[PDB]
């Protein structure tokens, strides 16, 4: 009968005691994100409503274009943000079931305090007035809205080559208490198959100051850049995986040959490009064990799937979806390559296909270690999987196969300063997850134990697996 | 308890509204399936109520072989339709948690009228009896079935060489008011490896009255039986893919040696077989967004595993199940490969393995069009899929990651008469699925939203979508 | 309330079902990794940690998460007491896991022990109680199988095995619970192995054959399936990580590979897989001209972490989930033996549910006449062995095949504490049926469902196993 009362996808009695008095009240840890750092460090203020919503992950649109909508109402320069934004207002009403109803009307609740009111054509303007005269106020500019969520850090994803000097004015700024740290995203160094590897490697090179004509200089180039982002308050890094490979590292004259080819322009086969891969992802992985930082691997997208829409608006704009390839091998390979020395860095894997679930929630278990709790992770659902059904599923398999109470947790992996509500949505289906389980006798309703993981899962896993111990 | 009453399946009140109130009062648009046009021309009336279940759909046969019946009485010649009848009526109780045992029964619930009754061996005998006095009538002869469930049009699967002389001969009737439209299925056209593809070949010559030489010849004669399908009222093709490949099309001088050296008795490359069936297929998708047909793609089916009964039997006679190749990459290229030019048409893609459930809900968010609600639709469970679990999977992973207001349905995807139950099992699932998500509050208990869903999701999309623009 | 005697079962059609017919029903543990040495000497244990701890390393794998040093796991150094005190600490993390269901199922069947959670503030208790239950005979090996009515078990053994303690079980009259042994031949066809020639040297000695040649290999693998046979043996088993197929070739070109295997040499991907099909296909045959089911277990991934397997050597806990694709070789393997009809009784194990509908819908191509379900999809094997791998193994096999017909569940244990498994399995089985026939979808019949659990439960294994 009620659409989004406060106890939304809360089930049970155990469930909305564990979400309103341990869940909700929580801050925020958000160790993995796509926000702008320069918006952060100049506070941006929006204009209006389209402006900070419109983009968001791209999953609006998708939902635009998967509704018909055309182009220019979307992406086009030729139309304005009220266009985009009725357009979108007509398309909402169109997303039944999708996650998109439910972030939609959770950010208009949190943080601009819209409730029992459906977003469609007859409230969009009413709601587009009122959210304009708050995002006008400094309560509801970058960092109100990240403080106005209780937000404690950020874990931004940044490239080797960046200069990291907005969050050197963040971290230099009195005015703002929550922490950017920058993370490490070296996928354009090892993904030497790409047509951008040497035009990148050249930016590299300047970066550094370095020559790259030999393997080892690729790894004192590296050495520099990790320097870098180590001054800057790194603590975690994240490689981005499309077709993951395994071939055992060859010695440095080999590697020298076939970055020599590389150089030349001479097409590489499938072994030297998984030497290659391999030889730099291991070498990363003994880097980020030495300074006790996080390496988070998400693996499985499948790319700018659609050419003629690439040429027009380039990558990251709503054209990539799942992979499929067979990983179990090539993974177990890899983090045995920097486990046998003892060389295997807390690690956080991520899979894009749910069918992988079990793979991984099994393969984490290989390579855990003494002293910490949950060496090894297995994330929360990913982005097409950041959803309920994803997340439940994710969920069920961590608990079958590992220790649910050691989960990091969730992440919002958003580039949106709207996207906070996603850890509401998370927790309120963990709540009822354990509330469920409880109340099915399948768990015991100790109040004290069921607190704790709560707890824990939310934030205190995340914060102390972070720490560069 | 009791078993299937009028509320089978609907396990809430807003379920039972959304069912009773707007679905069940809804016609079909049975897009997809593989009734005889020949019977649905002649009007046939079937001698008892073993020859109208068991000629097909093969499921009653698996069901037979696992409970240890001999063959003679299942596919045998040597025995009577009634001994065959008994058979079955010994093994359905049998098969409690299979859906045969919900299809058996809705099935004598509509169109027979038979209710409170369980098929077995002690009711039987009067259910044969009760249903041929009723087979013997024109409301159940083959149209009389169709009509009595409510079914206005009807889209069977046909080969290009098919003179289609039934679908004439239906359109030309008054006296049928259900539209019957073939479907274009030119798999042994694009199968160049199976070894009858020369025999096939020839038999598209004498149905084009075109010599093919020349990859160009093939275009020729695929366009005039483009054209003759048209001509009987096409709207739309179908594709069953067990090896889905690609590679990128070459120039005709390439293509015209590979079908040379096809015709030669050669045996072709796996790269040559890759690049003549994705030059066939490319082709093909352009000419059906030319003429503005549904293109559908059905992957994954293992075929003809069991020698010893393929040599007595033949093939679709119950020995195909679910293959698992990768096939994400290869079904990205192949829709860009149309899309590139703006060419791809209105698709519709299945997946034999649920495991590619989410593969293809974010596939079909790649390439989107303007114009046209859901231009690439994620298909409802197919085949071994089509029963409570796989399409509850499949709905959750569309409505995830789709758009589920937009889809266009239930197909039954069947050769028999008495399938439309199908559409019964499919609505009730439905039904329930957005009757309790609004029970729960995670969408809005609106009747007047929620039942226009329902109503577009049971014809209304079907309608508009097959409809050429 | 937390694991009461209705534990997971959600409403009266179910609690019927179980308490009335699954519960009281004996267990055929068709499949398990018990000790036949243990079961012939009847071994009696020291203490709880001893006979707990190793289980099926699924604690190993959950301390290790949980941080806790080696030494306290697998370390000769620490004591029994120590460990399970490691252990005592860590079960309070493992909500959610089906190792909060295990621990206190194992310490309400047998050791009587309810209304308590294991951890800390009660593990010394615990400790003290199970000590002195386990001194008694009641709590031996034995004691133990009788107590949770196991009326018959498949160990699982290697043909060089002599089967000394199956001959001695079996003329021991004050044990009437038939052990039987069953054939794994894994070693024998996983010729890329490095250990193949040793092995193949234990065969010769233990055939008294010479094996130069391949049909020698048949005449040696022949004397030994007939020594399996005169000890009872009626099924086999075979662990696939690399389910391969490749056309068996003519016997020149299988002796030419097991030459170039005894001369060192390394063989190619089709080499491998010939060898492989040609041993799987004819061991395939004989199983089903002696009547015996044929056991696949696939999909592992084994021994991921070097550094670890140099420690502690295999089955230490780290082996997981692989991912290759398997319907194509599968299929022409199954119908390399079903060509000449001579595929025998088989029950195919993924250990990636991904492909339980994969699995679920191959062998309704193989089905055969006189026997319900010939070919069979095995219960959530491993890591699948819990609540939501069950179900899920359930769900698949009830749309795709017949229910009524499914032989059921097996420990696949080396643990005499593991007979829960079956209590937790007919739980779960008898709730499923239960909310089905509560929600309308299946008749609700006394008669049609418990003749259903009991078959279920019992009556299907004991029919399939027999050689008949
Ligand atoms: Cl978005
Ligand atoms: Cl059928
Ligand atoms: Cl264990």
Chains 1, 2 share one sequence.
Request: net charge negative; proline share 4%.
């Amino acid at each position: 009968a009620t659409f989004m009362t406060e106890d939304f996808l809360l089930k049970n009695d155990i469930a909305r005691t564990l979400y309103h008095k341990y869940a909700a009240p929580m801050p925020i840890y958000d160790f993995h994100c796509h926000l702008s750092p320069q918006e952060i460090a100049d506070d941006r203020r929006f204009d209006n409503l389209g402006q900070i919503w419109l983009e968001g992950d791209h999953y609006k649109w998708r939902a635009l274009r998967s509704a018909g909508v055309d182009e220019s109402l979307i992406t086009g320069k030729e139309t304005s943000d009220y266009e985009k934004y009725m357009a979108w207002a007509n398309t909402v009403p169109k997303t039944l079931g999708n996650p998109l109803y439910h972030w939609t009307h959770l950010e208009l609740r949190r943080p601009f305090g819209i409730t029992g009111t459906l977003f469609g054509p007859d409230t969009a303007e009413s709601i587009w007035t009122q959210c304009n005269e708050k995002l006008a106020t400094p309560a509801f500019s970058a960092r109100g809205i990240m403080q106005q969520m209780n937000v404690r850090m950020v874990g931004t994803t940044d490239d080797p080559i960046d200069s990291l000097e907005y969050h050197r004015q963040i971290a230099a700024d009195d005015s703002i208490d929550i922490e950017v740290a920058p993370s490490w995203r070296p996928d354009k160094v090892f993904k030497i198959e790409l047509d951008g590897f040497v035009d990148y490697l050249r930016k590299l090179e300047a970066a550094a100051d370095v020559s790259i004509t030999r393997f080892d200089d690729l790894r004192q180039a590296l050495t520099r850049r990790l320097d870098h982002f180590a001054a800057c308050g790194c603590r975690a890094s994240d490689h981005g995986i499309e077709t993951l490979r395994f071939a055992p590292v060859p010695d440095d004259a080999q590697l020298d040959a076939i970055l020599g080819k590389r150089l030349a322009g001479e097409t590489l086969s499938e072994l030297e490009i998984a030497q290659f891969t391999t030889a730099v992802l291991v070498w990363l992985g003994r880097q980020y064990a030495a300074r006790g930082w996080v390496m988070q691997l998400h693996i499985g997208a499948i790319r700018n799937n659609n050419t003629r829409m690439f040429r027009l608006l380039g990558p990251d704009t709503g054209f990539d979806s799942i992979g499929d390839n067979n990983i179990s091998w090539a993974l177990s390979r890899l983090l045995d390559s920097m486990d046998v020395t003892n060389e295997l860095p807390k690690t956080i894997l991520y899979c894009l296909n749910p069918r992988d679930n079990e793979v991984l929630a099994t393969m984490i278990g290989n390579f855990q270690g003494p002293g910490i709790a949950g060496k090894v992770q297995f994330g929360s659902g990913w982005w097409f999987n950041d959803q309920k059904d994803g997340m439940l599923r994710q969920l069920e398999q961590l608990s079958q196969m590992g220790l649910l109470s050691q989960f990091v947790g969730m992440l919002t992996d958003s580039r949106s300063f709207l996207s906070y509500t996603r850890h509401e949505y998370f927790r309120r289906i963990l709540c009822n997850l354990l509330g469920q389980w409880a109340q099915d006798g399948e768990i015991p309703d100790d109040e004290a134990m069921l607190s704790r993981m709560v707890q824990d899962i939310c934030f205190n896993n995340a914060q102390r697996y972070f720490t560069i111990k």
